[PDB]
Amino acid sequence: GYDLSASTFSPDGRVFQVEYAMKAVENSSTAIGIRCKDGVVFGVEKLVLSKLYEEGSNKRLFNVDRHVGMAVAGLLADARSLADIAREEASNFRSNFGYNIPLKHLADRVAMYVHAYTLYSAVRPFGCSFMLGSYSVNDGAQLYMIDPSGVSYGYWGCAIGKARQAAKTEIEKLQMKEMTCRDIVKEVAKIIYIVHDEVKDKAFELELSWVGELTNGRHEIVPKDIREEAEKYAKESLK
Amino acid sequence: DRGVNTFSPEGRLFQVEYAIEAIKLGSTAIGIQTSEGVCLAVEKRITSPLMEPSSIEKIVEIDAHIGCAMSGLIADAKTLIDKARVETQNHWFTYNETMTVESVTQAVSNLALQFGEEDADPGAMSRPFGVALLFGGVDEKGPQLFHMDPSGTFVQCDARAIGSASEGAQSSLQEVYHKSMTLKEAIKSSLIILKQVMEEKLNATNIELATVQPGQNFHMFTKEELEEVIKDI
Amino acid sequence: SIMSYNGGAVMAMKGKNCVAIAADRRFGIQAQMVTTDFQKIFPMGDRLYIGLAGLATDVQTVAQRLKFRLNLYELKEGRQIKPYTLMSMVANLLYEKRFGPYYTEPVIAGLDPKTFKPFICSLDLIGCPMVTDDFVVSGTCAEQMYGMCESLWEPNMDPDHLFETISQAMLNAVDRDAVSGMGVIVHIIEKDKITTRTLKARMD
Amino acid sequence: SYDRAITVFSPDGHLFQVEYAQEAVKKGSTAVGVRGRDIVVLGVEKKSVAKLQDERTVRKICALDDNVCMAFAGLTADARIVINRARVECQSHRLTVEDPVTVEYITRYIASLKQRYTQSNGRRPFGISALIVGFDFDGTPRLYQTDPSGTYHAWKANAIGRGAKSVREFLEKNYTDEAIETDDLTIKLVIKALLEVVQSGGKNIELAVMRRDQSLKILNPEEIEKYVAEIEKEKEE
Amino acid sequence: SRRYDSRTTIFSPEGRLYQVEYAMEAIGHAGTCLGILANDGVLLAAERRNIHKLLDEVFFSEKIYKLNEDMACSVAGITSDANVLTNELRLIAQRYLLQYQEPIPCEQLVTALCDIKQAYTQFGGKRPFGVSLLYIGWDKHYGFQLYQSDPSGNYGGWKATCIGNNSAAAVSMLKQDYKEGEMTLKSALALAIKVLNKTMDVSKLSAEKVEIATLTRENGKTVIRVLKQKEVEQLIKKHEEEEAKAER
Amino acid sequence: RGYSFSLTTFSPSGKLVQIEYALAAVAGGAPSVGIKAANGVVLATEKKQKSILYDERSVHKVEPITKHIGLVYSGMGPDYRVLVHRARKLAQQYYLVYQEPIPTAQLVQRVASVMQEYTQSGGVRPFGVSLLICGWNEGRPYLFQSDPSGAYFAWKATAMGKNYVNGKTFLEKRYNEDLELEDAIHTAILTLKESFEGQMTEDNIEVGICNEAGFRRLTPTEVKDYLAAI
Amino acid sequence: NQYDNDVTVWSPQGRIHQIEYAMEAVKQGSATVGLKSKTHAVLVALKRAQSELAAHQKKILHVDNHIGISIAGLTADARLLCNFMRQECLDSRFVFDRPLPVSRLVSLIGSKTQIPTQRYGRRPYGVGLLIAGYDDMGPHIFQTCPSANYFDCRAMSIGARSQSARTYLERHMSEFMECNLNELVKHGLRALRETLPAEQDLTTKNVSIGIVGKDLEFTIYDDDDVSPFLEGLE
Amino acid sequence: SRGSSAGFDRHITIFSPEGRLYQVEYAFKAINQGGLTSVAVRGKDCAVIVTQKKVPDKLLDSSTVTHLFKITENIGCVMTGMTADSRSQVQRARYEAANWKYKYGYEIPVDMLCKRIADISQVYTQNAEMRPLGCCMILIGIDEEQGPQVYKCDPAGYYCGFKATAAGVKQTESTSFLEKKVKKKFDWTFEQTVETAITCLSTVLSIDFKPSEIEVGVVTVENPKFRILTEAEIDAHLVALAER
Ligand SMILES: [Cl-]
Ligand SMILES: [Cl-]
Ligand SMILES: [Cl-]
Ligand SMILES: [Cl-]
Ligand SMILES: [Cl-]
Ligand SMILES: [Cl-]
Ligand SMILES: [Cl-]
Ligand SMILES: [Cl-]
Ligand SMILES: [Cl-]
Ligand SMILES: [Cl-]
Ligand SMILES: [Cl-]
Ligand SMILES: [Cl-]
Ligand SMILES: [Cl-]
Ligand SMILES: [Cl-]
Ligand SMILES: [Cl-]
Ligand SMILES: [Cl-]
Ligand SMILES: [Cl-]
Ligand SMILES: [K+]
Ligand SMILES: [Mg+2]
Ligand SMILES: [Mg+2]
């Protein structure tokens, strides 16, 4: 049995324990990020498993620094712990070097930490993928995505979870380089509604956050009224 | 073979369930709580006439106001008993007051699931304790009897048997117990029940009995005091 | 001064194909003599001796611990240690205590176990080695000892002349030091024999 | 450092490593202890004979302190570790209480050492039982037994090791006030008890006595075969 | 990781320690090694395995080790393991000498090492050392002594014994020929050769194929010496001459 | 944290199979040869060097430990590098204490001791290498072999790696006690020719020598010269 | 099977069986219910009694003046977690001189309980909690699981037959926000009563109640102190 | 023997009965999981690294997709194999080099850096609790005495310096192409080093590249600082090759 430890290659050179962790992410509902002219917008299909839960419970969008948002899919406790790692890294960076961590460098650091959990019998890989988004006048808009193996790349648009491919094909239809965050939120809401399987899982909440010129480089929840306008646009577009 | 901290599909730790089974290999012990005090009684289980019966101790003093009866793997009980003793003395040292029966039982029970092979110091506990305990005493809540098993679960009982014949003994306890029962009745009741459940004929050397009363410190019955109680039974 | 607490003196001296090493015999605590046969020169081999002056407790500890190291060396290597290698062993041992030293300053005298060439050296309390071709001295009367050695020593002395010189150097040096003396012992080391003598000496 | 849990529970509440340690004890040479009126006696079997052996170097009877000694059965290398740990402890007790240990104190200590090695990571249990004998400050004679689990009890007489079942049966029928009324008879009771199991009697019974205040005497083969004959000829009658 | 741990320090169901037993099988295949006590001394005689023609012969022996001034040993089993143990024996003996300023009594050295071996069977999850040792020595408490220890951490004193290949056979021959209280170093030497001759039954006994060391007392000092090959040949000669008498 | 149990253990017949298997890695390695002459020692080895694309001078199999001691191996190269580094470090630790270069035999003992650790210590496999170690001290040449068990032996001449058994019998019918070093170098290269396959250039063998002057690798141009006869 | 003994072993479907198994410890505990209004947070719990002569296990524990918990699962793990929560609360009052916000404490439980789910030879916590709290953001009911996930709830039930309690709670949750304290506890008790076999009823021996709100520190009601609340379930 | 197995010799780095380390073998297979090939060639004046650049997804920021890394100002690297493993090895190399400079006062030689990474990889082949990294590192730099340098180290902890080398799926084919070419050349030495690298890669893959489908990095005796070619720069080479 070649698939019980992250410290064992299979005879074909695979690490099944990392692949299995990836399957946990691909069972999760869908998260998307889109980079545009003046920032980055995140959206999450947030399945409601009980009507007894408060609206806002089990957030999948996190502030990891004042200028950096994180959007997650997969095992949520693993994702939160990673948000804590990312936070700590951003904090330590500021204490040591005296300025806000560059997004790319934060993505690389956290990805190496994820990577460290893919080498050993002593620990298991994280069952999560996540996106990091930021904006500043100096660096522009940046959107990175990290998976359970610890690979980290930059994107114009990205999706993770179980309708990943369907989401991407819709994202590809946007000329996001020429769009603002205010336009893109509506398109994010639209795509979540398109890929949502309303027969198989009934109820969901749309979760929206952004970072861009319009928020002054701060990662913030999309305001309630803009979210509701976006949902209404998405739902009516589905017709 | 699997690790000592493995859950079964029913949500129990195999090691703890197995430690609970080891309790069934112990001699029967009985605790009864009355408004006049608590009694503890235990089958010694003499295996040879050459063995000294007084060297079997399955009832011990924790402090003046608290005794403890044990069943299961008796060697495992020693560190639990010592922990209880040290804790009550620490409480006395720090607070200048006696520790409640409940609090002692609680402190001991926090040792319960502290086993495992890669969180802890170079050779910590490899397994749970194969022991059940009855703590009987008197504190300001009045007389009190508490039971504890290898899960760390502990609870107050009005009357309770543990060990091999405890189903059996517990039935007979439901039958005879009443809230207004006297201590002398409880003493007689528990020796009648031990007499039923023991393989050997009950006498004044193959059992022990102790009491704690609001009046009076932990008291182990002498051969002579046991014989007087055995006459009726 | 920590090194004058017990007092004492050692020296070694080179001759043709022989060496000599000598020591006073007093063990005292400040003014008080306690014993007059206290050992300060210790064999480290058939033809290799170490003499230690300084604090009596450290004389004994360094001698014992050096012996520990030497026995293991010899069992493990093929062979009897060379004089120069003993010096290095001692240096290393003393320097390990660089920031809390043993208060002893040894001299070594011997013949190479294969070549029989004469060797002498001394070391300070932290293990600085000093080899010479003439003599070395260590103890509470070093200045006295240097005066006698500089004035009397000559190259290529035979065993009898070496014996007389080291003896006169010792006796007259310690007789100007209150806390050294109560006897003098001398070992003459040759290829074929060791000669050990105690000297007629002042006992005040 | 090695932290594997070695002694663990099995279904039904068994500790298999402890049971297996107990099997090691059952294969050891037979050891016997009898508490007399003012004497205590330990006797032990064999183990190998062998003419070329230096007899001195393999004894299974051991002083712990002036007033306490022990015999063991089982893994001899394990026994040595226990014995030395107990010897150290007797000196700590003396250090901090300025009395010798009671026999019960040192038994209690050995037992709890053994129990710890059934509940600590990285270690197997000790494969020995011990018969521990001596006298308390007030002259009371004592015989205790420990086993690999850490359980311990006091005994009037007992046996451990191979054929302990049958030797214990014999002691049960033969341990009376009469059989221990005197020192010679107490010693004879140990020998008779061994002579029941000891292959080529005997020959290979080692034997030692402790008297009140008087410290461990080992009997020598000349002194033993005196008792052997003195009992073998009494059983003809 | 529990899957890969072979559990070298646990009991089997009969109260056995398999790694110790298995190590004892390793030893049984190693070079034969015997020890004989006499009135005027003690000896070790060992089969050499380093016998290939192209070997270079650089130390004073192959399997005889000096431990301190008054003691030596020989070994049968894994050689590298024996090097660790003999190094530890030397350390212990010097620790004792440091502390007490007198040599370690023989049995005390043996016991100290056997406690290390015992530990390796009880905790640590490591393979035991694949070595049995014969120890010869003199001390002021029991004079000339011979000890044997094995991977269980067990030891004993012996007047004559053998470890390694064909031990059981060697010990039978010793049982039969050894005179308790009446042996000299000269007669023990004769017996040693007699024993090796029978137990190296593959094949015809040569000085190049054995090593003998003796331990004696001269002028209050212990002398430990490995016999030169001339002396070993002479002893082999004398044993063959002796069998010439054997019938008439 | 690391595995604390031994990965080498005794089998039911008394064998340490991991060490046997390490020996099989050695037997499958490229051939190495060592000859002790009267006035020196030669070590020679084959480069398992495919491709002309290799820079043959970029890594060496014949390596100096000290001015007076050198090494070669058969088996796994990366394991060898571990032991080269440790040997060098051990030699320096000795020199700092004793102020005398480490005797070849003392160095071999300490290196072999390290190899023994890897047969017993937690969570590691033995080294898949055997070393040949040469040196000069006490006015005299030394050739030693150290195997994966931590066993070591002094040789007059030997071979290791592929075809070593034949290599050994080839040396047996060819070595004499009174042989000079320049002659010994020739017989070392002939011994590699026995089991070569490929045609020998000075770029695909390596040769090291050890005499009173110290240890050094022969240069390509020097190896070229010895190869012209062979 | 090969995938179910270690919390570090992912299965081929992207599950961790050890965590699922730890969750069964909570499903087999006795039921407890948590709910809230605009002003109060309530916990109600059923106590399982071992025999007829046993008192009945404590289900409700004090954490701080503003926080209490109800437990389901391994009692020893419940106490270990309770002690952690107590300590975090004391630390916050020591350092800042104000109550630890309930959501922040719950975050700390998540982070703490996630750790052993990812290291070899460790195990999940076999306990689930309902957490009643009051702070600047009003009343709270949180739920924690052996998976280290947690949930912010309008109301919740865990333990054996809690699905009935959950259903009742969905049925009436639109009422809860505007309920007075007595109405709210009554609702809690009715939900809990849904978990019981048709025969059996809520009694002063088996019901335990915990309450916190705007005007009221976390208080536990047992035995005779529950009778006011049980009478006029009319 | 011939593919025999005992115990856990396919799961952890213990010896098989032939003396093999299967887990190390399998780490080499992991290098090919990525489906990419890299080539490196050295001449008298420069050393070059060329690799494939695959951007299958339109939605990637292709500026973030690279396998070329700067280790110091003067040492460049191409990585082949598992991406996250590769990144980790890059960080380690960067750390080893920075540390070298701090302790010793001069830049780490390329050979020493390659050796150090190889030695670190060796530990993963002898210790049982972690796996090897399923990646391969090729390093380039200028050495003052020896000229341009190309070094490679692998998951076994082997390393070597080269005239030219390759890694990944078409490693063997690249090795043959390059071998055939050096024999032809005088003093067995490449001269047209960027052209040879790109041609080798294009031959073994049968692609004929656009300037967005490869990456090129260089160090030169005149300009020892590691330089990554731009698209246009690469295009000028692709066009000069197209026309002969
Ligand atoms: Cl995904
Ligand atoms: Cl029970
Ligand atoms: Cl020291
Ligand atoms: Cl202990
Ligand atoms: Cl027994
Ligand atoms: Cl010595
Ligand atoms: Cl000694
Ligand atoms: Cl381990
Ligand atoms: Cl190196
Ligand atoms: Cl050097
Ligand atoms: Cl060189
Ligand atoms: Cl519960
Ligand atoms: Cl529980
Ligand atoms: Cl969950
Ligand atoms: Cl539930
Ligand atoms: Cl720097
Ligand atoms: Cl070219
Ligand atoms: K490995
Ligand atoms: Mg004077
Ligand atoms: Mg005077």
Side-chain angles (χ1 to χ4, degrees), chain F residues 76-96:
Chain F
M76 292 162 71
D79 283 10
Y80 172 67
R81 295 205 313 279
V82 179
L83 299 159
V84 170
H85 179 85
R86 292 289 281 89
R88 283 171 175 168
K89 173 60 160 173
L90 290 160
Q92 287 309 307
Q93 291 163 325
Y94 186 99
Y95 187 82
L96 291 161

Short mmCIF file of all heavy atoms in Angstrom, two decimals, chain F residues 76-96:
data_model
loop_
_atom_site.label_atom_id
_atom_site.label_comp_id
_atom_site.label_asym_id
_atom_site.label_seq_id
_atom_site.Cartn_x
_atom_site.Cartn_y
_atom_site.Cartn_z
N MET F 76 27.96 3.45 -3.48
CA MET F 76 27.17 4.65 -3.76
C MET F 76 27.95 5.90 -3.50
O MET F 76 28.38 6.14 -2.38
CB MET F 76 25.92 4.63 -2.93
CG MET F 76 24.99 3.51 -3.37
SD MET F 76 23.83 3.18 -2.06
CE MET F 76 22.82 4.65 -2.14
N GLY F 77 28.13 6.70 -4.54
CA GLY F 77 28.94 7.92 -4.45
C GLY F 77 28.47 8.94 -3.40
O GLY F 77 29.26 9.43 -2.63
N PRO F 78 27.17 9.25 -3.35
CA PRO F 78 26.75 10.23 -2.36
C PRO F 78 27.00 9.77 -0.93
O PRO F 78 27.38 10.60 -0.08
CB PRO F 78 25.28 10.45 -2.69
CG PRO F 78 25.10 9.98 -4.13
CD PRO F 78 26.05 8.83 -4.24
N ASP F 79 26.87 8.47 -0.65
CA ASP F 79 27.24 7.95 0.67
C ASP F 79 28.74 8.18 0.96
O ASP F 79 29.13 8.58 2.04
CB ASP F 79 26.92 6.44 0.79
CG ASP F 79 25.39 6.13 1.03
OD1 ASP F 79 24.52 7.01 0.93
OD2 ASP F 79 25.11 4.97 1.31
N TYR F 80 29.58 7.92 -0.04
CA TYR F 80 31.00 8.16 0.07
C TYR F 80 31.35 9.60 0.48
O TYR F 80 32.26 9.78 1.26
CB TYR F 80 31.68 7.86 -1.26
CG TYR F 80 33.13 8.21 -1.39
CD1 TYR F 80 34.09 7.55 -0.64
CD2 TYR F 80 33.55 9.18 -2.31
CE1 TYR F 80 35.43 7.79 -0.83
CE2 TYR F 80 34.88 9.45 -2.51
CZ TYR F 80 35.83 8.75 -1.76
OH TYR F 80 37.17 9.00 -1.90
N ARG F 81 30.67 10.58 -0.12
CA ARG F 81 30.90 11.98 0.21
C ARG F 81 30.65 12.30 1.69
O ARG F 81 31.40 13.06 2.28
CB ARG F 81 30.07 12.91 -0.67
CG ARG F 81 30.46 12.88 -2.15
CD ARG F 81 30.08 14.17 -2.85
NE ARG F 81 28.71 14.57 -2.51
CZ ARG F 81 27.60 14.10 -3.08
NH1 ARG F 81 27.66 13.24 -4.08
NH2 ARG F 81 26.41 14.53 -2.66
N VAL F 82 29.64 11.65 2.29
CA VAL F 82 29.41 11.78 3.69
C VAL F 82 30.66 11.38 4.48
O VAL F 82 31.08 12.10 5.39
CB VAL F 82 28.19 10.96 4.21
CG1 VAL F 82 28.02 11.15 5.74
CG2 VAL F 82 26.89 11.41 3.53
N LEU F 83 31.21 10.22 4.13
CA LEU F 83 32.28 9.64 4.86
C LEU F 83 33.59 10.40 4.62
O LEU F 83 34.41 10.48 5.56
CB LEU F 83 32.43 8.14 4.55
CG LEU F 83 31.19 7.28 4.91
CD1 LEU F 83 31.12 5.97 4.17
CD2 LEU F 83 31.16 7.03 6.41
N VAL F 84 33.78 10.94 3.41
CA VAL F 84 34.93 11.80 3.12
C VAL F 84 34.94 13.03 4.04
O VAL F 84 35.97 13.37 4.65
CB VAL F 84 34.92 12.27 1.66
CG1 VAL F 84 35.98 13.36 1.43
CG2 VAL F 84 35.17 11.10 0.70
N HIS F 85 33.80 13.69 4.12
CA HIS F 85 33.64 14.85 4.98
C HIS F 85 33.89 14.51 6.46
O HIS F 85 34.61 15.24 7.16
CB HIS F 85 32.28 15.48 4.71
CG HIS F 85 32.00 16.65 5.56
ND1 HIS F 85 32.42 17.92 5.24
CD2 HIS F 85 31.34 16.75 6.74
CE1 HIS F 85 32.01 18.77 6.17
NE2 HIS F 85 31.35 18.08 7.09
N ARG F 86 33.35 13.40 6.94
CA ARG F 86 33.55 13.01 8.33
C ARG F 86 35.01 12.65 8.61
O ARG F 86 35.54 13.03 9.64
CB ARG F 86 32.68 11.83 8.75
CG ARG F 86 31.18 12.09 8.83
CD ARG F 86 30.72 12.98 9.97
NE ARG F 86 30.64 12.31 11.29
CZ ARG F 86 31.64 12.23 12.16
NH1 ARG F 86 32.85 12.74 11.87
NH2 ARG F 86 31.44 11.62 13.35
N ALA F 87 35.65 11.91 7.69
CA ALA F 87 37.06 11.54 7.83
C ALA F 87 37.96 12.76 7.94
O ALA F 87 38.88 12.80 8.75
CB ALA F 87 37.49 10.71 6.68
N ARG F 88 37.69 13.75 7.11
CA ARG F 88 38.45 14.97 7.10
C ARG F 88 38.31 15.70 8.44
O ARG F 88 39.30 16.12 9.03
CB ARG F 88 38.00 15.87 5.94
CG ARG F 88 38.54 15.43 4.59
CD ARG F 88 37.92 16.19 3.42
NE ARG F 88 38.57 15.81 2.19
CZ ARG F 88 38.14 16.09 0.96
NH1 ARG F 88 37.06 16.81 0.78
NH2 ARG F 88 38.85 15.68 -0.08
N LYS F 89 37.07 15.78 8.91
CA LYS F 89 36.75 16.40 10.15
C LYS F 89 37.39 15.65 11.33
O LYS F 89 38.00 16.28 12.21
CB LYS F 89 35.22 16.50 10.26
CG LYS F 89 34.66 16.98 11.56
CD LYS F 89 35.17 18.37 11.89
CE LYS F 89 34.27 19.05 12.92
NZ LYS F 89 34.91 20.33 13.34
N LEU F 90 37.32 14.32 11.32
CA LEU F 90 37.98 13.51 12.33
C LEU F 90 39.50 13.70 12.36
O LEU F 90 40.12 13.69 13.42
CB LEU F 90 37.66 12.02 12.14
CG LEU F 90 36.23 11.64 12.46
CD1 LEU F 90 35.86 10.31 11.79
CD2 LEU F 90 35.99 11.57 13.96
N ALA F 91 40.10 13.86 11.19
CA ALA F 91 41.53 14.05 11.11
C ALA F 91 41.91 15.38 11.76
O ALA F 91 42.93 15.47 12.43
CB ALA F 91 42.02 13.99 9.68
N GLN F 92 41.12 16.40 11.50
CA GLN F 92 41.37 17.73 12.08
C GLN F 92 41.19 17.75 13.61
O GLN F 92 42.04 18.32 14.32
CB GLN F 92 40.52 18.80 11.39
CG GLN F 92 41.01 19.16 9.98
CD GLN F 92 42.48 19.48 9.92
OE1 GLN F 92 42.97 20.32 10.66
NE2 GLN F 92 43.21 18.75 9.08
N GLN F 93 40.13 17.11 14.10
CA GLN F 93 39.91 17.02 15.55
C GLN F 93 41.10 16.37 16.26
O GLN F 93 41.56 16.86 17.32
CB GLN F 93 38.65 16.28 15.90
CG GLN F 93 37.40 17.02 15.52
CD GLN F 93 36.19 16.10 15.49
OE1 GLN F 93 36.28 14.92 15.13
NE2 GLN F 93 35.03 16.61 15.91
N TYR F 94 41.65 15.33 15.61
CA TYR F 94 42.82 14.66 16.13
C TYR F 94 44.03 15.63 16.13
O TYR F 94 44.73 15.74 17.12
CB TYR F 94 43.14 13.44 15.31
CG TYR F 94 44.26 12.56 15.83
CD1 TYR F 94 43.97 11.43 16.56
CD2 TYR F 94 45.62 12.86 15.58
CE1 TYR F 94 44.98 10.60 17.02
CE2 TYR F 94 46.65 12.04 16.07
CZ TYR F 94 46.32 10.91 16.77
OH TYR F 94 47.29 10.06 17.26
N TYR F 95 44.27 16.29 14.99
CA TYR F 95 45.40 17.20 14.89
C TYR F 95 45.37 18.36 15.91
O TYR F 95 46.42 18.71 16.51
CB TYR F 95 45.55 17.75 13.45
CG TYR F 95 46.80 18.53 13.29
CD1 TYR F 95 48.00 17.90 13.05
CD2 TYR F 95 46.80 19.94 13.40
CE1 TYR F 95 49.19 18.63 12.91
CE2 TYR F 95 47.96 20.68 13.26
CZ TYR F 95 49.16 20.00 13.01
OH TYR F 95 50.34 20.70 12.90
N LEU F 96 44.17 18.89 16.18
CA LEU F 96 44.04 19.99 17.16
C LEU F 96 44.45 19.55 18.56
O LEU F 96 45.06 20.32 19.29
CB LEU F 96 42.64 20.58 17.18
CG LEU F 96 42.28 21.35 15.91
CD1 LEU F 96 40.77 21.54 15.75
CD2 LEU F 96 42.99 22.68 15.88
#
